[PDB]
Subunit: 582 residues, 3 copies
């Protein structure tokens, strides 16, 4: 019972799901109890074909059937799922819900300033996506092209991603905080034919330089033929380069409210997302179409317990994977509304999150612990002014959640009435790897709990490289077989992909994290083993900041390390200009 290795586990009482969770859920839970979950998990590991085939058919709409559920091995880095099938991401995210119920809300958009907020129905979303896709189609964008998006977290970002997917092209989303150099790097690696951006952004009430950073970068991006610019502020003084830049409203007005979607293969790339890595310049993680979408829908449904009546508020940015999977694809695939928040938790005050939750009766809230630390320090008193009784599932993402914050999250936001899901995963996994299912798995504060369907977690001894049998163990966290939403390569550098994930421990997937497993099987994430730092949920490379500093001629040598920080979890102008303010 007492753990000599897993010190986190000693004397920690299991936390059962509160009664209010089950009272508030609109329908019967998808899994009755933890024992049914283990039966389903055991099948998803021993019999992936008989487990994932039927779910793929239930949760996704197929234009062509698949003939093989699963192919490939980690060691050969040739994993593939639902081979021979064809589908379209935007059809599954928009069309089929629009045909069923066109007036159902899809994008609940909360602007930096609430006066500018608006809601798009699934019918509205189909017309806007079709028109932007029509613009891209007129420009020669076609299956196989890549299109960059440089937009803040608002409706137009979702529409751009979905419009690119409609044509069979792959979107490459670039966080609005990146510098012109970071834009240049990503656009050139992917050889994007087109870019979608806006004139300016609004964050915390302050104007943001968007188009200007694009122009500075594009002088070195010869592959970009055309740019679509949305008028977020409609500032007249913002310059558009003639013959290359065109206005969103002007061009979409030229095209009809329906455009047929384009079928792609299960294993055609849905998108590229450039993550910072221990070695080298940022690398474009590639995700397939079928496997990624299934992983997104499946995890959204089962870990968060999402039903059609529910509303999900993921306080993330599509510049990162959390927005991709659980702000856009996960919820829309399931046909529920998703809340897209452009602003910050502090503007106009530290009750903004709670105003939104009360306003739209959100049932699920998904945020990074860094925000919880901020609200604990500055905004605790406002929580009580807003009605949060609509929530039943509260999620944590992107970094460890200390047991103290877990309790703060549970009581002050959850009112000790909600289920807390500490979701462990990474950009390369596509979706959740270890997380406690809402309404099924009791919680240990700070523990990611059991691994998800199709995730065969294991601990390896770093020095011997041998998998660690038995519980009460510590080691590098690895997976013993690939899973549907696993990233398939790094764009045009599959060798980097193999050397990073598959080759260090042959037969395994290397998460880059160390973890611990206790006698109950709960996993405790102990953090990166490599030189990758996590600052406020943002993944950074110590090499990239060291490179930015050395770029300055005055610098002889540079060395970067990470330390504990109570607000953010973990020459200055040179690093801001090389990488980004964050």
């Amino acid at each position: 019972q007492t753990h000599n290795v897993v010190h986190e586990a000693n004397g920690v009482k299991l936390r059962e799901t509160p009664k209010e969770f089950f009272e508030r859920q609109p329908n019967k839970g998808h899994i009755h109890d933890v024992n049914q979950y283990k039966q389903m998990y055991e099948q998803s590991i021993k019999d992936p074909q008989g487990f994932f085939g039927p779910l793929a058919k239930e949760l996704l709409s197929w234009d062509h059937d698949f003939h093989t559920v699963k192919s490939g091995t980690l060691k050969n880095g040739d994993a593939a799922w639902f081979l021979g099938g064809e589908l379209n991401a935007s059809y599954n995210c928009v069309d089929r819900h629009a045909f069923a119920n066109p007036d159902k809300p899809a994008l609940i958009c909360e602007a930096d300033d609430e006066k500018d907020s608006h809601i798009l129905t699934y019918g509205d979303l189909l017309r806007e996506v079709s028109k932007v896709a029509g613009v891209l189609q007129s420009w020669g964008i076609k299956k196989g092209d890549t299109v960059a998006v440089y937009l803040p977290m608002n409706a137009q970002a979702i529409i751009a991603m979905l419009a690119i997917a409609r044509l069979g092209a792959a979107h490459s989303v670039i966080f609005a905080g990146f510098s012109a150099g970071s834009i240049k790097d990503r656009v050139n690696d992917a050889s994007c034919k087109a870019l979608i951006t806006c004139d300016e952004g609004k964050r915390g009430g302050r104007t943001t330089n968007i188009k200007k950073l694009c122009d500075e970068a594009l002088v070195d991006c010869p592959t970009v033929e055309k740019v679509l610019v949305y008028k977020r502020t409609n500032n007249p003084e913002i310059h558009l380069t003639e013959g290359r830049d065109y206005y969103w409203d002007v061009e979409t007005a030229k095209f009809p409210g329906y455009l047929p979607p384009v079928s792609v293969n299960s294993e055609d790339p849905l998108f590229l997302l450039y993550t910072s890595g221990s070695t080298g310049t940022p690398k474009g993680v590639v995700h397939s179409t079928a496997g990624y979408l299934l992983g997104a829908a499946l995890s959204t449904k089962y870990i968060f317990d999402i039903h059609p009546e529910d509303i999900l508020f993921t306080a993330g940015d599509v510049g990162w994977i959390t927005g991709h999977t659980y702000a856009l694809y996960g919820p829309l695939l399931l046909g529920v509304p998703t809340i897209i928040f452009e602003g910050t938790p502090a503007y106009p005050d530290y009750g903004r999150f709670w105003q939104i939750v009360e306003k739209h009766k959100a049932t699920h809230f998904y945020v990074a612990p860094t925000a919880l630390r901020l609200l604990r320090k500055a905004g605790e008193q406002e929580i009580a002014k807003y009605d949060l009784s609509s929530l039943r599932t509260l999620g944590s993402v992107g970094e460890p959640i200390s047991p103290d914050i877990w309790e703060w999250y549970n009581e002050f936001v959850g009112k000790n009435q909600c289920h807390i899901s500490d979701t462990y995963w990474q950009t390369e996994s596509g979706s959740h790897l270890i997380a406690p299912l809402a309404g099924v798995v009791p919680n240990k504060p700070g523990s990611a709990s059991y691994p998800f369907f199709g995730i065969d977690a294991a601990l390896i001894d770093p020095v011997t490289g041998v998998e660690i049998e038995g519980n009460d163990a510590e080691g590098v966290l690895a997976i013993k077989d690939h899973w549907p939403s696993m990233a398939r390569t790094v764009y045009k550098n599959h060798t980097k992909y193999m050397d990073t994930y598959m080759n260090p421990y042959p037969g395994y997937y290397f998460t880059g994290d160390g973890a611990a497993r206790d006698h109950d099987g709960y996993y405790w994430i102990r953090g990166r083993v490599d030189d990758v730092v996590n600052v406020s949920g943002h993944r950074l490379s110590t090499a990239e900041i060291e490179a930015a500093l050395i770029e300055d001629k005055k610098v002889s040598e540079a060395a970067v390390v990470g330390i504990h920080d109570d607000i953010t979890g973990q020459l200055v102008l040179q690093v801001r200009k090389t990488i980004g303010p964050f």
Copy 2:
């Protein structure tokens, strides 16, 4: 019984279909009587899914099934039919019939001079279409491209259109009578990658300059990469530009008689057709084809044994729908007439009908008036007893012309189908079904399947219930063959058809409905601007302004406005307010212009 509004209907006896019609039709009619037609029509309006789904499966061959029969609304201009389905126009018009009976005639071509007439079987058509598609494919034409056609009404025009559709590209057919300026405008708006044409044309025994006008246009058409030139006259003096112009016979000889067709989406554009600044009406693939086949079958009573002679030009919608797509989809021969009704003499139409024993004849009243004036004696010289359905298209047919048509051509033995429709509708909207609907001469009669016809008051925009009424002719829901957009100007599409009377399709015509429900087309309306629900006449404002002695002349136009829908701009601070007050007291308070080629400058 007496009409107080629809004066045309007073004292008009219904004219039953003659017995010789049913004696001559090869099989039992597709609809038994007017009551069965009413049942089918009510379903096509109340239950479009359960009506059109089965017909789409019966009449068309699908490469991929559709999952939704009908989508969209007029007001959002996002109409779509048979979503998720894939098919090919040339496969449904050529391939499937060629496999069934390759020797059945497909294109009965009558040349300007009969010596050059010839017949192509469906097998022949498949080979010629395959070869032209092979030429275009080797040239890089692919799905998404547009290809212009500048050809007279002959086999090569049909072959080009089907070959372009075979690859998934959209053909944009340009009437051979158009000038170089008209060619340039259309080619550049569609950004065509290739052009198919001929060296010279023959009309009325006279040579027409075709390639020369193309060359004149292409100096300003940089998107045109290659031209395919047919040797219609084989004139040695006609020059071909090296590296751009290639001969039809030379290139088609290089490629085989089969080329796989390329599947497209139901809602992929089949073709662009520029209305007579010119705007490119776009038609979908599945919806347009179903409308063409369905109307041809039921309005005209077409069976596999029949032969159709549509005396129209593929430069216009009538040729597209009822000279090519309609009849070929159903697998019947179609007569493609290159020349004029007068050359070599004014009996040419009737010689053709006699020669090929055509059962169906479709012509415009303009031609009927000409032949009445100059060739009436010639009709009796020929055997026309093979005809049973006589169609009128494109303009009103007066009761006198209707009677002349019925007696001198029909011998009082045929059914007459006065077909009302437009380029944007793709196919028939109001027309009397052959053998089913008794007609009133000068009346198109009942609206067709999927066409929910209505009359709206021009001032209020409110639908006029009840019969013995007059108003703007509108449609209450979209239909499969309805045009989907104006090429790269969907705003003009909405402003023209969907915005003037929201929730309706605006035909631009006025009509009247009598106590029996028959519609009487009264012709184009004044096309009144709509500013925030107040409908205004630009002509009335020009007149009110001209009444002012200070005004030299006045010209008023309408443009799109983001707040009020349409805006009125007047071309002619004390005099501007004096003119605005002149318009308010002459016309009305809500008729004052927003401000005082003219449309494009106003729209910037």
Copy 3:
């Protein structure tokens, strides 16, 4: 019983399949008896829809079903099969078998030197094909493009072909024996966007220049954007042109081991294979996808009696049609291992074929009679060193097999215990046309026997142009309807296709061969009627050789003809007249020069057996050369020239005769 026309058939005892064949056969045979074969054949002729439709569904994996089994006619040149259907060639050859059993051997690669041999499983092949296709995809290769392959007979050539097909593009394979000019001709006609090759080759233990010949040709191939070079010898001295040439290993390392295959239409072109004809320029025969693959699978399965347990050794090169169909597509479609031999039958000794068979326990062996003649002359002693008891089907391809060689093949290789399948067919047929099915059809040595499924064979009278009813006949060999794997066109020259195959005998396919049919219906191939030479199984154009000789400025005129050869079947004799040279000292000096001219223009294998220097070539009143005179003289039929008064230069004939006598053997 006695034949009055078909003398080959007189006094020829039928040879039943040995009993050992069925003992060695792993399962029940695919065909019950010859009567079942006759019934199936009749249905394949009278009811092609009900016969081939079901077989196409059994043997191929379809991405879209077909709606019409068969379309078009020979006379119109618009043949088509399985219309509306979609599939992918590399999926049916690799993916589907890899998913079933990833570890099963697929490519048994035997290198020029056995130390370098290796085996690729179907899983290995899927990853390698996926990676090469990934490189081509990154380079912009897409459905509709053509890609040239210039590689020896080894794994990388197979991988290249399958990777190109995976993307929906058509491969055009160029035999490694071709010179730079022949590469240039083929690459430019097809307008290939990319080329796949290697640095150097190994044959008979000697290094061959491969990339060097590509570089020479590519200076005049402006359509080629990028080249993929495999490191066969990894010789550092081989130069790669910057911006165009990239190494196979470096680029494939950038892309993953799975790439989704691209659906193509049944009638989208699978490949171009440039054949020589009676033209003087090679013509690119085009093959469809569905029909060709079905033909490959069907003939491999039924003519050779291939089961999943079997191992096929086709001793051919993918540079030619035999390698395409029966070294790559046939066996891989059926999911069995296939042996890819890079070297020669003689290196390191004349037992190499048999070493390979014994090493891998091959069950089927497929070779050209030219090789049999070589091993009979030089390597007969080697046979006894090897265990050949794993073989049961022995095939002959590409040229007539004399009854003596048929017996030699039967005794020393087969041990009088195997079935022998003399397969008649050609590049344009895609697959076997007339062949005795293994375990079903009794053999007459030297006879291809009965026509195969879907092949309605006929003999036409050379004089009347009328089909010959009844047996004991001879005439032009023609086919009365098209068949699935028939070539569909000549690339961008459909007129040459029609004039060559479909127009000469309207309503028929013209094989270019003459044949005879005996009282039993067995067909006896009597050889080309269109003056097309076959040297050691290589199809050559005498016109193309004349052109190469004329390129030499010393040459005034050239006339090339074919004669019988005891080693190579047919040999090429070149008669040359020189502009300004009657010098007898130059004699052999310029004869070698001319031979080298042919070697550098076309390739070493096209080199003439002999060059005859003459003062004048015999010509007509119009001035055309009379090649019949040269044929008869070279065949030692000097008599049988007949009246030569019709020549403008009858006196030239005597000089030709004496020139041949004085120069042929020396």
